[PDB]
Write a protein that binds this DNA or RNA. Structure first.
Ligand SMILES: Nc1ncnc2c1ncn2[C@@H]1O[C@H](CSCC[C@H](N)C(=O)O)[C@@H](O)[C@H]1O
Ligand SMILES: [Zn+2]
Lengths: 692, 294
RNA sequence: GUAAAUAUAGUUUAAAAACAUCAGAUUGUGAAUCUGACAACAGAGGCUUACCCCCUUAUUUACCGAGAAAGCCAUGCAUGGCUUUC
């Protein structure tokens, strides 16, 4: 039933240690993805990749780094309205699918099928997929394109005087397409004579090789030997997802050489250097102009030495890398991302009042007095993402890190892809930074606020290998539901809880009662590790099992984080005269009814609590896409107001400086200011229409 | 070989023209491949079809007029108006002469209105033909008006494609059109303060027509959308920009917010003659909006 | 930003006509014409005779995370609160 048209392969993820190993294929009939991994939702959204018709999702290995992001993709598909979706992998995924339910949310009108390894074939007559198991467990997939022999030779039908312009000729097409020989124009014409040499379909293999224990078995594969040498269906290309060390193995090199020049040997690994978000780099570079350390340059991956020149070609993978297969097989590297910081700088410079505002701020700061009291740089606070929902290009799911001391760091809102921002923000020092972590805090029970919890832990082990320190089960505080579903994942899909230690949030509540002596020992160790004096948890009235946290150190500085909540007196009592407050800010004023319905406060409520808190400074967080790029500004806001952005660095000494940055911010958002003006006009029109 | 494969696709049954000229084949060859040539061939075929249909209709009407003329001859009633006529029937000539006098008066004392022909690099051949046709319609609408503008054709390169097409289309009338055509820009002819550059992407919204302001319309037809081109050009010279009020007065419904040159000039002429915004915006195509906001 | 629809380059209804546009005609009162110019249903890409789709912009509309099972407390077999399981 028909034949496939032009088909394209794409490298969604460059293969870096942060959000790597993501492959994509698209044709007119349908499209597919391999190794969704983690954080690929934002990457696809930024690059305008179509998510519709992504019926099938594939993978190579059970590691969370290959399957962590399924939740976001399935939720996006559910929002779109696609009714069906299927997965391919080991049977244990079924249990893993069940796991997602515990934090899936309302899932309806969507089918979650599975394609175990035992399945013989998939077919669909568009593209065929082969399942190949591996053992020391990994699965690789060989995909063969469908046959498209349908063709007709030029001008020889006219020489034969075929009865064109009629209907009875249409069936005859099949006679020549199927392979029938007929007598026409006094010639016993064969079908092959009037048919272009059929092409059964290009083939390509996707495989991940963790180490030599998986290098050895692959060669002793009958399926691979079938396509090695004089393959029945010659392989157009092969994509390898393995590190450089695996890529240089003698057995691996020989296996690669087996195919010969026919293949192209595209590769993907950590060594690849590229940018996964042009917008993020552009905005952070532009912000770096205003002040260096508040907006530090985002270190970009840059491999020191290119991989060794192996005998076979090694096509290093890159983000947005494109390869057309039909009707031509070539590297269509036309829309590959490029790094041009100077272009971004000049584009920002060519804005109204931006450079002038920056110069005025420079003059004010230079003339301003030096910080009194010589406040110590530590502790530091870095906001990785401030998004409140499915992450967008501008922002990211809420996530913050507080460095109490160069050897003590705490994490709040370990959302989806947090490790990605950690990598993008701390380059190679990520190892030291991860080793610095003492514990991770969990906000109100919700998938967005704990999506990325597993990946971090795994990476920590790797960091521990780099430092060589003894195993240290990382501490985390959260309700028992987190423990339950993490245990299910541990005992079903991938064993991770042995690397973690859990603490109920209730036991940390004000006036709480110790549940067990082990809990007391764990909390005492937590307090000792970060040199903290008091860690307080309080209930918040936005949903069941929700906690807001407060940190009080020996130096006396009190920092209070709330997350999803509404103005609560208990919060004020807990954080009375707090040094700093970071509070959610989802919607704008005048929308109190929907704010109550969604159980999220607005700006006016933020100022009301802040003045109620009596805290020295207040910071806004947890924003929505409606505030695409700019937060609300008004002189009515106190100087204590603080607006967060991706990878925003702040310290105590910066408290008297945040308001001074208000102008330049709005200076950079001129187009976004116009967008806000249009949005306000639309809101006014809607409100007046509703009132009348 | 070339016309051979063209005849091959003819045999394929594709809609193609007949007895095509050499320039048309050159233009077809200029196309890249496949769809471009197919669209051009379908165009030319439809053009020939319309031409032949008009020829048939014209011949039918000629024969009908001949037979009806003999029938009207059969009456011979005579006594037609008693031959009491005050004027000869030379009305088209008189209308042309009156329009010429009005155009001279406008060239001497009329309000300037500029079409800047600085987009030849942003337009394909088809868009260039469309721009020329709309320029003719706009100029014609200006001539008939009770108070014509003084039309300037600024940035019009002498040997450029647009000037060549305008000359070809106007013939000897080109040298007699009562308008100022010059290679210089609108900024070299008028003070920068009096120039308002009309664009659909300007932040500012036009409120009232000003009689001491020189309005600049971009003689640009982009069926391939290129937003901000006219705004970008106006920004290099640092000229004030205004946009027609279409969200304020019309419920836009479905359509494109950039009007044609003829519609723009008709709106501006209605405004210049003390017309209101409803009357002026009656020239917006009805298919786009749904009504005038009350 | 994401899904839907829609896109007539002079206008409208249709699926090609009518009204319009430019040049020439010193027109005997139907010039209510004659001779010409223009004629592209948003922009780009195939593919089987014909069978449609894929993509990019533009306009309008609506916009992202808790099912059941068992044990207890209160209300009038049903409801609210909590605890363990997936
Ligand atoms: N809504 C509107 N407001 C103001 N000028 C408009 C307009 N619609 C059309 N125009 C005028 O008509 C011209 C042809 S429309 C071409 C628009 C093109 N995007 C551009 O860059 O201009 C425009 O250049 C502008 O001069
Ligand atoms: Zn949140």
């Amino acid at each position: 039933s028909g034949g496939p048209n032009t088909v394209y392969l794409q490298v969604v993820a460059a293969g870096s240690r942060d959000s790597g190993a993501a492959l994509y294929v698209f044709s007119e009939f349908n499209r597919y993805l391999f190794n969704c991994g983690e954080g690929v939702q934002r990457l696809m959204q930024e690059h305008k990749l179509k998510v519709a018709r992504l019926d099938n999702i594939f993978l190579t290995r059970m590691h969370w780094s290959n399957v962590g992001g399924l939740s976001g993709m399935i939720l996006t598909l559910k929002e779109t309205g696609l009714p069906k979706c299927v997965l391919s992998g080991p049977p244990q995924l079924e249990k893993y699918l069940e796991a997602i339910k515990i934090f899936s949310g309302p899932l309806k009108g969507i089918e979650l099928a599975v394609r175990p390894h035992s399945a013989p074939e998939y077919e669909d007559e568009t593209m065929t997929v082969y399942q190949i198991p591996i053992h020391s467990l990994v699965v690789a997939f060989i995909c063969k394109l469908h046959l498209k022999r349908g063709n007709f030779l030029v001008l020889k039908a006219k020489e034969m005087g075929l009865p064109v312009g009629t209907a009875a000729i249409a069936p005859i097409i099949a006679a020549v397409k199927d392979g029938k020989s007929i007598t026409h124009e006094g010639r016993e014409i064969l079908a092959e004579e009037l048919c272009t040499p059929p092409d059964p379909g290009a083939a390509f293999v996707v495989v991940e090789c963790p180490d030599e224990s998986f290098i050895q078995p692959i060669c002793e594969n009958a399926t691979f030997q079938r396509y090695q040498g004089k393959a029945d269906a010659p392989v157009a290309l092969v994509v390898h997802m393995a590190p450089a060390s695996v890529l240089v193995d003698s057995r691996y090199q020989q296996w690669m050489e087996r195919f010969g020049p026919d293949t192209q040997h595209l590769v993907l690994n950590e060594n690849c250097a590229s940018v996964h978000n042009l917008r993020s780099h552009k905005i952070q570079t532009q912000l770096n102009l205003i002040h260096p350390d508040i907006f530090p340059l985002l270190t970009s991956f840059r491999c020191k030495k290119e991989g060794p020149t192996l005998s076979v070609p090694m096509v290093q993978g890159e983000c947005l890398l494109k390869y057309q297969l039909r009707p031509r097989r070539e590297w269509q590297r036309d829309a590959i991302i490029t790094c041009n910081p100077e272009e971004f700088i000049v584009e920002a410079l060519q804005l109204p009042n931006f450079q002038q505002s920056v110069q005025e701020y420079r003059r004010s700061a230079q003339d301003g007095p030096a910080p009194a009291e010589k406040r110590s740089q530590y502790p530091e606070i870095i906001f990785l993402g401030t998004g409140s929902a499915i992450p967008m290009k501008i922002r990211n799911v809420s996530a913050t890190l507080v460095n109490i001391s160069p050897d003590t760091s705490l994490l709040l809102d370990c959302g989806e892809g947090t490790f990605g921002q950690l990598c993008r923000h701390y380059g190679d020092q990520v190892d030291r930074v991860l080793g610095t972590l003492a514990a991770v805090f969990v906000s109100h029970l919700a998938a967005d606020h704990h999506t990325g919890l597993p990946s971090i832990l795994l990476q920590r082990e790797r960091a521990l290998a780099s430092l060589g320190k003894p195993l240290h089960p990382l501490l985390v505080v959260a309700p028992n539901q987190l423990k339950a579903w993490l245990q299910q994942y541990h005992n079903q899909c991938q064993e991770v809880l042995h690397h973690i230690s859990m603490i109920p949030a209730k036991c940390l509540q004000e006036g709480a009662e110790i549940s067990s002596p082990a809990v007391e020992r764990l909390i005492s160790s937590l307090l000792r590790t970060c040199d903290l004096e008091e860690f307080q948890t309080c209930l918040v009235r936005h949903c069941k099992h929700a906690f807001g946290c407060a940190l009080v150190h020996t130096s006396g500085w009190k920092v209070v984080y709330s997350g999803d909540t509404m103005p609560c007196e208990a919060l004020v009592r807990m954080g009375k005269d707090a040094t700093l407050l970071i509070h959610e800010a989802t919607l704008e004023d005048g929308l109190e009814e929907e704010a109550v319905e969604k159980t999220h406060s607005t700006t006016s409520q933020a100022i009301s609590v802040g003045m109620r808190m009596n805290a020295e400074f207040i910071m806004l967080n947890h924003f929505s896409q409606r505030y695409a790029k700019v937060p609300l500004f008004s002189p009515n806001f106190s100087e204590k107001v603080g607006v967060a952005f991706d990878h925003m660095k702040v310290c105590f000494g910066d408290f008297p400086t945040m308001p001074k940055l208000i102008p330049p911010l709005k200076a950079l958002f001129a187009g976004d200011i116009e967008e806000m003006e249009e949005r306000r006009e639309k809101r006014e029109l809607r409100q007046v229409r509703a009132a009348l | 070989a070339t016309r051979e494969f063209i005849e091959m696709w003819r045999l394929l049954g594709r809609e193609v023209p007949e007895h095509i000229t050499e320039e048309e084949l050159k233009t077809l060859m200029e196309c890249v491949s496949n769809t471009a040539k197919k669209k051009y061939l379908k165009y030319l075929y439809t053009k020939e079809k319309v031409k032949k249909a008009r020829q048939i209709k014209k011949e039918m009407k000629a024969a009908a007029r001949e037979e009806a003329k003999n029938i009207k001859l059969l009456e011979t009633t005579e006594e037609d108006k008693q031959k009491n006529f005050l004027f000869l029937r030379l009305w088209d000539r008189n209308m042309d002469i009156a329009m010429g006098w009005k155009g001279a008066q406008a060239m001497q004392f009329g309000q300037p209105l500029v079409f800047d022909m600085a987009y030849e690099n942003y337009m394909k051949r088809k868009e260039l033909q469309n721009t020329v046709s709309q320029l003719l319609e706009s100029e014609g609408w200006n001539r008939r008006n009770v108070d014509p503008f003084h039309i300037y054709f600024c940035n019009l390169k002498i040997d450029g494609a647009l000037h060549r097409e305008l000359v070809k289309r106007y013939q000897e009338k080109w040298d007699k059109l009562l308008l100022t055509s010059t290679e210089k820009s609108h900024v070299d002819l008028f003070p920068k303060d009096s120039i308002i550059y009309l664009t659909a992407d300007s932040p500012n919204v036009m409120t009232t027509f000003r009689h001491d302001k020189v309005y600049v319309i971009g003689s640009f037809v982009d069926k391939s959308m290129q937003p901000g081109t006219s705004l970008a050009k106006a920004k290099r010279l640092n000229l004030a920009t205004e946009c027609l009020p279409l969200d304020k007065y019309l419920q836009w419904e479905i359509g494109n917010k950039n009007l044609t040159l003829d519609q723009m000039i008709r709106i501006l002429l209605c405004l210049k003659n003390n017309g209101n915004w409803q009357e002026a915006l009656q020239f917006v195509p009805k298919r786009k909006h749904t009504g005038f906001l009350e």
